[PDB]
Write an enzyme that holds these catalytic residues in place. Structure first.
Site: not given
Ligand SMILES: Nc1nc(Nc2cccc(S(N)(=O)=O)c2)sc1C(=O)c1ccccc1
Length: 294
Positions: A15, A123
């Site tokens: 991110y 993830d």
């Protein structure tokens, strides 16, 4: 920003960018993730304030969440190395099995905990598994898929690693289950053993086909409902499953058995983290110390 004496970039998370920073006040050394907005999903910030309560020895501790100036900062306990770097550093010798087994066992404990609290990682990959000198390994950088809507592209256009993605995600399933984390961990386990990524896809279709070429193209016999999945195509090539002893040589039968259960196609047949901890492979598990050069 003025609270953390300078810094030192240690990577660019999924991110944003991650930094090693020191609490200008307490002197505490932490890992700081800077999330790059237009308001910042109050929903996301709420679901984050929920990960703060997730405490477990095999989960990187989230110390604080700070929203300010449209930017979001996540403060985490700092660890000195990630499994990706450790594997590259051990590529010539290989990680000794007792240590592979210890890491796998600790990661399954961490997952059993997350999963019992209804939290999915989504993830998992070597880069977000952190290790210390004490022989511990911890889950980090939990992904909160969907989050705002549907994540599928970063800002730096930094290529997304698909090597550890479960097949149901690749086939377009809308709702992920705890099974996706077990698949990723199975792929990581195989990689520590062979010292080569199990399914190194370069695209979503190449990822799927690499899995099919090794485990066999799935059908209704091994995976009920697979042919009605969103991105399933009757035109997929039909590969025969490959002899499994060729996948992770020279791993013993206990290890191969557990891995086969972590890689079942049907998410409902895939072994749970809790059941995996009881597998015979862990009867002689210990907690070795890794050789780390920091
Ligand atoms: N907690 C935590 N620690 C980390 N250390 C670290 C990791 C790699 C290299 C080095 S270092 N010193 O340069 O050798 C240090 S990273 C991280 C994350 O919380 C995190 C955040 C986002 C994505 C993945 C992990």
């Amino acid at each position: 920003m003025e609270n953390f004496q300078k810094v030192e970039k240690i990577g660019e998370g999924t991110y944003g960018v991650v930094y090693k920073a020191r609490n200008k006040l307490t002197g505490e050394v932490v890992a700081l993730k800077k999330i790059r907005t237009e308001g910042v999903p109050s929903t996301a910030i709420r679901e984050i304030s929920l990960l703060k309560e997730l405490n477990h020895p095999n989960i990187v501790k989230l110390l604080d969440v700070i929203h300010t100036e449209n930017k979001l900062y996540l403060v985490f306990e700092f660890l000195h190395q990630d499994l990706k770097k450790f594997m590259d550093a051990s590529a010539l010798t290989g990680i000794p099995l007792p240590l592979i087994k210890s890491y796998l066992f600790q990661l399954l404990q961490g997952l059993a905990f997350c999963h019992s609290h209804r939290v999915l990682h989504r993830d998992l990959k070597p880069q977000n598994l952190l290790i210390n000198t004490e022989g511990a390994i911890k889950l980090a950088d939990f992904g909160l898929a969907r989050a705002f809507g549907v994540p599928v592209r970063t800002y730096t256009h930094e290529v997304v690693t698909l090597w550890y993605r479960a097949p149901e995600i690749l086939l377009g399933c809308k709702y992920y289950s705890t099974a996706v984390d077990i698949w990723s961990l199975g792929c990581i386990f195989a990689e520590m053993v062979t010292r080569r990524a199990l399914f190194p896809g370069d695209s979503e279709i190449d990822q799927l086909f690499r899995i099919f070429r090794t485990l066999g193209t799935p059908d209704e016999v091994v995976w009920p409902g697979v042919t009605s999945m969103p991105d399933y195509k009757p035109s997929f090539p039909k590969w025969a499953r490959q002899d499994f002893s060729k996948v992770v040589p020279p791993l013993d039968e206990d290890g191969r058995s557990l891995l086969s259960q972590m890689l079942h196609y049907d998410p409902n047949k895939r072994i749970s983290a809790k059941a995996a901890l009881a597998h015979p492979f862990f009867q002689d598990v210990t907690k070795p110390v890794p050789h780390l050069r920091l």
